[PDB]
RNA sequence: AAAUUGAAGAGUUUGAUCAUGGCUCAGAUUGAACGCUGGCGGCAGGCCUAACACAUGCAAGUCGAACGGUAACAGGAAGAAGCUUGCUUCUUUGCUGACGAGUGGCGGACGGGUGAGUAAUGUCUGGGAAACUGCCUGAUGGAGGGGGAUAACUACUGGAAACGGUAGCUAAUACCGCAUAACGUCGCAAGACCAAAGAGGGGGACCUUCGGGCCUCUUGCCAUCGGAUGUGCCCAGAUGGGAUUAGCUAGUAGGUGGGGUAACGGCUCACCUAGGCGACGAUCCCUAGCUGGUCUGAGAGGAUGACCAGCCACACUGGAACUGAGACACGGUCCAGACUCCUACGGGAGGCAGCAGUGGGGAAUAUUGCACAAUGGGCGCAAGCCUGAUGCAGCCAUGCCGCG
RNA sequence: UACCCGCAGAAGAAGCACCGGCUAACUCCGUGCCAGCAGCCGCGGUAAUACGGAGGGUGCAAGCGUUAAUCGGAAUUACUGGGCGUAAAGCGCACGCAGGCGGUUUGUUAAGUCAGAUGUGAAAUCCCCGGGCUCAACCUGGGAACUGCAUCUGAUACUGG
């Protein structure tokens, strides 16, 4: 359950560290993104020579929340924190080349099959 | 690993890591015992002990887990310190 | 065969040990003049019987703490 | 163990060998503790091409060092020679 | 007999001069490149840059004379037949020449690569004393009598793969008791205590349970004291620069005692003393593997550390120990990081600074070759197998020398 | 394979830089402070041996030039082996710790210094005399050298205690 000002931790070899929301896509008035939406971000933070820049305004998947999922039994998977893997601005595909931490099966896409191979645990 | 007998190596160097673990698991605790005695101020139970633990310090010298200069301090150090005490 | 070193006791402080300074000329590899140099050695002294500024006679023997691998053999002048 | 054996010298096409007294492991044209021949397979043999210092390879022997085929043959052949 | 018995100067300030002083040239040298040109050969050299990243092959195996063994192929065999009656194909059985997979032994600590790190657990010279040391070697004795397991295999079962789960079952030079036990370890001594393993080749009376006994020799196994080689450790001197770095230090310096190592040691811990280092350059900062030697110079020096050889250090990065005589392991293990590959999505796999080769960087540096014939290494009684060590071949005028 | 014999025919095998002084090698034509050369000086505005072409010549030769690079010449970091009045260089002056140096005699010591002996200074490399590839490069025997270090024993003039 993200949102424009949200920070979010990443969950990639991108060389990003911290990202802020700046828009919420796919809809008017739309107000929170959660697993398996796209964001709009700028880099808050990155390491020195990595993909990506300080500054730089991309998008990203979100990938695990705090808000979690719900599963259709009832069920609930809970993050302790907010992560997001980059894409490409135009493509939509990952920038980075591994993942790191635990990613849900709600990513299952065609568009993001990449990024549960890469992941070391999948719930 | 990734040649032949490396990943044989390996098996076999795991057989003998447990193997040796044990039998010398097994001859520090003789050796504590002694010790135990010592601080306890006890000759009887510290002359006993160290009679039980000299044929294991030795045995496992002659069996190469340890050599056999380990076996003659420990030998050597109790001793002496027994013998301070009574 | 007595291989040994003489030189004078700069400080007594330690117990059991002291600081020798062993003083040499040497010729300079390069510009000829003959300098000074010295080569200060921690030794035993068991008993502590050197006091400082005495001349002592020292003999290299086996590690006896982090420093010292020589002990003393014999004072040879004192108390100037 | 110590072996005594022939460190390959010369030149290329031309092969000339050092007899060495040396720690097996060490590379055969390095470390050695002690030269005590040389053998020239391409001598003319109107003039030498093959000398040992039997005296110093016995002493070895006798202290356990092992010996070459080929130093064992030129051993024979050297002591049929004279 | 001989073996450092060797040393040059020119142009350029001035109208001209002498002095001062820099710039420049003649010389040797090079792991070179580029431009023009280019016939052959012998010997040598060949990523100096990115310790940048690497597809594919190959670079560490071997022993059936330790062991249960057969699945391959090779014969052999009572007995099935090819039968055209000595030629034979298959059903069978390890009977044996061998041998996949497995246990076991020895080697994977050598050989080969690199110079990142390191101004010192480094190197060089010269000395020390407290130690271990596979294979090889001399000496003297052992090699007795037992026991419980297990891989392979069999049955059932999970995986896409990697690789597993159950219960069976079995061998040995795997593993463990027990005995034996000193010129061994502990101990003043009295005493106390410690090991092991078989496997082959041939054979005379003699004979059985036809396995062999027994006879004999080879070989391996255990103990102890030596030799040889290897390695660990300690001290002194030397081994770069900087003060636009002057103070540094709590395991710090020493002492006692316990622990610890193969061994001396603040190696470690407790307690005690308050020391230890430093202008003869400590501390901090920059740089760097050291040497034999190499180039230059009459020399003294200066510069340098490819190719060869010695020592050290490293093995994708950081850390760790396990096995072992030896490693904190170059093609081993574990954790963490960076990165890459496989996947049926659940999970797996790897580390060229070995030899070729590729991308990248660069002014610039070679073939994904042949062979174990020779020397040398590993295993084996041997035969032999393995060996990108090595021997060779290919490429380039890169250099030296020879010839056209 | 090395090497030896035979066959065919001069047949298939010459380029690169330079020529003003330093520096071996000179003329013409073109250009005209342009185009251009240039290690240093310095060439180019109408005779340019200096640019560019040509003929001629010099030096090298399967290479030749240019660039890069170390040492040399450079006595230009001067230990061997230099300087500071006017050329670069005496601190504006004095006191003074550390340090360097220290008059003269005797005795002593024996660290410096000197002598001898012994061990070590790996091999290769360098050098000398030989040997082997048709020669040479290359390979190789023996020597000499490693001018250094260390221990012991002496010498005692000089320096130090
Ligand atoms: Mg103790
Ligand atoms: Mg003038
Ligand atoms: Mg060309
Ligand atoms: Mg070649
Ligand atoms: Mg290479
Ligand atoms: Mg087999
Ligand atoms: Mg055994
Ligand atoms: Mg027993
Ligand atoms: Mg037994
Ligand atoms: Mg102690
Ligand atoms: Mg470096
Ligand atoms: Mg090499
Ligand atoms: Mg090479
Ligand atoms: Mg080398
Ligand atoms: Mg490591
Ligand atoms: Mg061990
Ligand atoms: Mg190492
Ligand atoms: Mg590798
Ligand atoms: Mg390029
Ligand atoms: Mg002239
Ligand atoms: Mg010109
Ligand atoms: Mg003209
Ligand atoms: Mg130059
Ligand atoms: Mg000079
Ligand atoms: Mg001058
Ligand atoms: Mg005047
Ligand atoms: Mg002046
Ligand atoms: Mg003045
Ligand atoms: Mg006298
Ligand atoms: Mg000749
Ligand atoms: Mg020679
Ligand atoms: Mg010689
Ligand atoms: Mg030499
Ligand atoms: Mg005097």
Same mark, same amino acid.
């Given at each position: 359950?993200?949102?424009?000002?949200?920070?979010?931790?990443?969950?990639?070899?991108?060389?990003?560290?911290?990202?802020?929301?700046?828009?919420?896509?796919?809809?008017?008035?739309?107000?929170?993104?959660?697993?398996?939406?796209?964001?709009?971000?700028?880099?808050?933070?990155?390491?020195?020579?990595?993909?990506?820049? $300080?500054?730089?305004?991309?998008?990203?998947?979100?990938?695990?929340?705090?808000?979690?999922?719900?599963?259709?039994?009832?069920?609930?998977?809970?993050?302790?924190?907010?992560?997001?893997?980059?894409?490409?601005?135009?493509?939509?595909?990952?920038?980075?080349?591994?993942?790191?931490?635990?990613?849900?099966?709600?990513?299952?896409?065609? $568009?993001?099959?990449?990024?549960?191979?890469?992941?070391?645990?999948?719930? | 690993?990734?040649?032949?007998?490396?990943?044989?190596?390996?098996?076999?160097?795991?057989?003998?890591?447990?193997?040796?673990?044990?039998?010398?698991?097994?001859?520090?605790?003789?050796? $504590?015992?002694?010790?135990?005695?010592?601080?306890?101020?006890?000759?009887?139970?510290?002359?006993?002990?160290?009679?039980?633990?000299?044929?294991?310090?030795?045995?496992?010298?002659?069996?190469?887990?340890?050599?056999?200069?380990?076996?003659?301090?420990? $030998?050597?150090?109790?001793?002496?310190?027994?013998?301070?005490?009574? | 065969?007595?291989?040994?070193?003489?030189?004078?006791?700069?400080?007594?402080?330690?117990?059991?040990?002291?600081?020798?300074?062993?003083?040499?000329?040497?010729?300079?590899?390069?510009?000829?003049?003959?300098?000074?140099?010295?080569?200060?050695?921690?030794?035993?002294?068991?008993?502590?019987?050197?006091?400082?500024?005495?001349?002592?006679?020292?003999?290299?023997?086996?590690?006896?703490?982090?420093?010292?691998?020589?002990?003393?053999?014999?004072?040879?002048?004192?108390?100037? | 163990?110590?072996?005594?054996?022939?460190?390959?010298?010369?030149?290329?096409?031309?092969?000339?060998?050092?007899?060495?007294?040396?720690?097996?492991?060490?590379?055969?044209?390095?470390?050695?503790?002690?030269?005590?021949?040389?053998?020239?397979?391409?001598?003319?043999?109107?003039?030498?091409?093959?000398?040992?210092?039997?005296?110093?390879?016995?002493?070895?022997?006798?202290?356990?060092?092992?010996?070459?085929?080929?130093?064992?043959?030129?051993?024979?052949?050297?002591?049929?020679?004279?």
């Amino acid at each position: 359950m993200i949102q424009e000002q949200t920070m979010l931790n990443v969950a990639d070899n991108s060389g990003a560290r911290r990202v802020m929301c700046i828009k919420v896509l796919g809809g008017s008035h739309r107000r929170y993104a959660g697993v398996g939406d796209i964001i709009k971000i700028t880099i808050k933070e990155a390491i020195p020579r990595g993909k990506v820049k $300080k500054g730089d305004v991309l998008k990203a998947v979100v990938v695990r929340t705090k808000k979690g999922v719900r599963r259709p039994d009832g069920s609930v998977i809970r993050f302790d924190g907010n992560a997001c893997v980059l894409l490409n601005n135009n493509s939509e595909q990952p920038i980075g080349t591994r993942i790191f931490g635990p990613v849900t099966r709600e990513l299952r896409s065609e $568009k993001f099959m990449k990024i549960i191979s890469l992941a070391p645990e999948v719930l | 690993a990734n040649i032949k007998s490396a990943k044989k190596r390996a098996i076999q160097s795991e057989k003998a890591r447990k193997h040796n673990a044990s039998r010398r698991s097994m001859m520090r605790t003789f050796i $504590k015992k002694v010790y135990a005695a010592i601080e306890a101020g006890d000759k009887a139970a510290a002359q006993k002990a160290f009679n039980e633990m000299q044929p294991i310090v030795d045995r496992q010298a002659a069996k190469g887990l340890i050599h056999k200069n380990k076996a003659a301090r420990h $030998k050597a150090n109790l001793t002496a310190q027994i013998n301070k005490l009574a | 065969k007595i291989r040994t070193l003489q030189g004078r006791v700069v400080s007594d402080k330690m117990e059991k040990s002291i600081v020798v300074a062993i003083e040499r000329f040497v010729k300079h590899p390069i510009y000829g003049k003959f300098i000074k140099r010295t080569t200060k050695l921690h030794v035993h002294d068991e008993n502590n019987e050197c006091g400082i500024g005495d001349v002592v006679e020292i003999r290299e023997c086996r590690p006896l703490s982090k420093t010292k691998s020589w002990t003393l053999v014999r004072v040879v002048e004192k108390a100037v | 163990m110590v072996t005594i054996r022939l460190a390959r010298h010369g030149a290329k096409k031309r092969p000339f060998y050092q007899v060495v007294v040396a720690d097996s492991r060490n590379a055969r044209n390095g470390r050695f503790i002690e030269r005590v021949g040389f053998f020239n397979p391409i001598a003319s043999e109107k003039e030498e091409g093959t000398r040992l210092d039997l005296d110093r390879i016995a002493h070895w022997v006798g202290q356990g060092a092992t010996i070459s085929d080929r130093v064992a043959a030129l051993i024979k052949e050297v002591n049929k020679a004279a």
